[PDB]
């Protein structure tokens, strides 16, 4: 159904392709040309996962594992039950993610708002793309992508991390991790100000932007502002997604030794006395 | 000669601060390259003497 104010916004137009052929709503969802492709690709990938689970012998969501082909198969296609099903789902997954981002462009174009949300999602897609196709292409085999399992894809992270003998010493991992722990810190503090100002102690008037602006001035000596926090909050999250893509694309295509050995440039500088 | 006119361009308070910082950092840097060498390192040189 609609909302109390939704009717005045559901106008015709704003599509990127297909016009009014697909321009309608199914329930609350908006269907576009890319909503049709999203439905096809997502459903095809979902069914193929359970088809592979049926042949795997288990339907347990923890134990379902669709794995890439061996490194021997290279960049070519593999038998469906020997790693080819994973490749098809990857094509479906990429098609469903790109369509989802393009569908968001149509929605935000129909509402006359900015395209920040689809652009931010593209960084998430870029991180997924650099894990499943970009990095395997550089390393020369489709078997370097992570498997499609709830707990299996943690084993891929564990072994890939320990393939460089200490993955905490990765300079890009060091930067990327700093962005998660800070984005969550920024999210916690930003969400606290709005909640604290809008929900004061019982019997007290609600607070305006000035009161929360002066709180952090009293608290940490500097306040970034109502607009600045969202502006810097997106940048912290986008940098987190980007630098996480960097830490994994340089592990194997750019660096093959252990990651602690990378810091040997700093230890053995000519300036340091012997 | 007529070099005094530089103060009609440079702010005396803004250049004195820069000159003071530059002079000390330069002095510390030269004092540090001497200690890097094994010939002019007076700390290690004194240890070699009377030993």
């Amino acid at each position: 159904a609609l909302l109390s104010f939704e009717r005045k916004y559901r106008v015709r137009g704003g599509t990127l392709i297909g016009g009014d052929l697909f321009d309608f709503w199914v329930g609350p969802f908006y269907v576009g040309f890319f909503g049709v492709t999203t439905a096809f690709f997502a459903l095809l990938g979902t069914i193929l996962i359970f088809w592979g689970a049926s042949q795997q012998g288990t339907f347990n969501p923890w134990l379902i594992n669709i794995a890439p082909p061996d490194l021997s198969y290279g960049l070519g296609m593999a038998p469906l039950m020997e790693g080819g099903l994973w490749q098809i789902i990857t094509i479906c997954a990429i098609g469903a993610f790109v369509s989802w981002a393009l569908r968001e462009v149509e929605i935000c174009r129909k509402l006359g708002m900015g395209y920040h949300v689809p652009f931010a999602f593209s960084v998430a897609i870029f991180a997924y793309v650099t894990l499943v196709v970009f990095r395997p292409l550089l390393m020369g085999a489709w078997g370097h992508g992570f498997p499609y399992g709830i707990w299996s894809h943690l084993d891929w992270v564990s072994n890939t991390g320990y393939a460089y003998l200490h993955f905490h010493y990765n300079p890009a991992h060091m930067i990327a991790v700093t962005f998660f722990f800070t984005t969550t810190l920024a999210l916690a503090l930003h969400g606290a100000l709005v909640l604290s100002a809008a929900n004061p102690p019982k019997g007290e008037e609600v607070k305006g932007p000035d009161n929360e602006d002066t709180f952090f001035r009293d608290f940490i000596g500097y306040s970034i502002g109502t607009l600045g926090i969202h502006r810097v909050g997106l940048l912290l999250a986008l940098n987190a997604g980007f630098w996480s893509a960097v830490c994994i694309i340089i592990s194997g295509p750019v660096w093959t030794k252990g990651w602690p050995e990378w810091w040997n440039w700093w230890l053995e500088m000519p300036i340091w006395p012997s | 000669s007529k070099f005094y006119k530089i103060w009609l361009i440079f702010d005396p308070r803004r250049v004195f601060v820069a000159q003071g910082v530059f002079l000390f950092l330069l002095a510390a840097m030269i004092h540090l390259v001497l200690l890097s060498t094994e010939h002019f390192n007076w700390f290690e040189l004194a240890a070699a003497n009377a030993a």
Partner: protein
């Protein structure tokens, strides 16, 4: 293209804002010294306003510096007061926790005794800062959401260094005070107790850590998308819903079938961030005290994947083949 609100195209600077005040007399503890930075004003507010210094702020800063000095000056003494070596090994030095042989007793100064004294001052400094956050909210007549959220972070901070060492009965279970060393502790902690990936609370805490970055990217971009309708003024949109809140809600309703309000988004934002250390704190507490091996726990509870392929490299290639000879 259209102007994306990522950098302000023009900045206006007037008299410094000294902040609001009430009968609590906030101004008598304020520094009243302000400075304006134009570089940071391209993305946020350009004023480095006065800071409220009370007693919880002063106590935390003084005790925090003592912890900083004791850890730092021990590191300098470790390399024999060699400043060039102190800088070179700065990321590698630390103040190691006490040896396991001393249990919960006070160890010698050179073998973790200074670690306990330094940790005592850090504990005082962190708790004092929490009290300052709680006190400031009370004096501003605002909600205590900042203090409660910060208390969630302290919960993992307390568990990781205070509560768990007491339960194991050994001060040696604390985290060393080093840049690289507390990364070494993190890796060694996972290896010692099985595989921390299979800790259900570590998995759950990652869900809320990913969700936190997920949701703040979603919220950060949505507000920037509706900032053309005055969407950055979130507080006024709660009290009087404008077109900015409607379009932001309708964008997500048409995308994923449901949305939030301008206030309710910050309840989602608050809870995912707060649940990140709360769940992790429980997972670290159960590690060592209860389980002692997480992968074997996973095998027992039947959520550890099983593999049927071979393991050696001889089952996939040859040494000569890999070398191309």
């Amino acid at each position: 293209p259209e102007y994306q609100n990522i950098f302000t195209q023009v900045q206006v600077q007037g008299p410094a804002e000294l902040g609001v005040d009430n009968e609590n007399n906030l101004t008598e503890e304020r520094t009243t010294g302000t400075g304006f930075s134009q570089l940071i004003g391209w993305i946020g507010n350009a004023q480095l306003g006065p800071i409220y210094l009370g007693w919880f702020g002063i106590i935390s800063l003084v005790t925090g510096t003592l912890w900083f000095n004791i850890v730092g000056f021990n590191m300098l003494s470790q390399v024999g007061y060699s400043i060039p070596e102190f800088i070179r090994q700065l990321f590698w030095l630390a103040l190691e926790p006490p040896s396991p042989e001393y249990g919960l007793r006070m160890p010698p100064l050179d073998d973790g005794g200074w670690f306990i004294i330094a940790s005592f001052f850090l504990l005082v400094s962190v708790i004092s800062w929490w009290l300052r956050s709680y006190q400031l909210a009370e004096m501003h007549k605002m909600g205590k959401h900042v203090a409660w959220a910060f208390a969630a972070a302290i919960w993992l901070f307390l568990v990781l260094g205070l509560f768990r060492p007491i339960l194991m009965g050994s001060w040696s279970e604390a985290v060393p005070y080093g840049i690289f060393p507390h990364l070494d502790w993190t890796t060694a902690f996972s290896i010692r107790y099985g595989n921390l990936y299979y800790n259900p609370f570590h998995a759950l805490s990652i869900v809320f850590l990913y969700g936190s970055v997920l949701l703040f990217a979603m919220h950060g971009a949505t507000i920037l998308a509706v900032t053309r309708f005055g969407g950055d003024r979130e507080l006024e949109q709660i009290y009087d819903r404008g077109t900015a809140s409607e379009r932001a809600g309708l964008f997500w309703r048409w995308t994923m079938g449901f949305n939030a309000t301008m206030e309710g988004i910050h309840r989602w934002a608050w809870w995912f961030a707060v649940l990140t250390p709360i769940t992790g704190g429980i997972g670290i507490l159960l590690t060592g005290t209860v389980v002692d091996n997480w992968f074997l726990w996973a095998v027992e509870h039947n959520f550890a994947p099983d593999y049927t392929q071979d393991y050696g490299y001889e089952a996939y290639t040859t040494y000569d083949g890999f070398l191309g000879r």
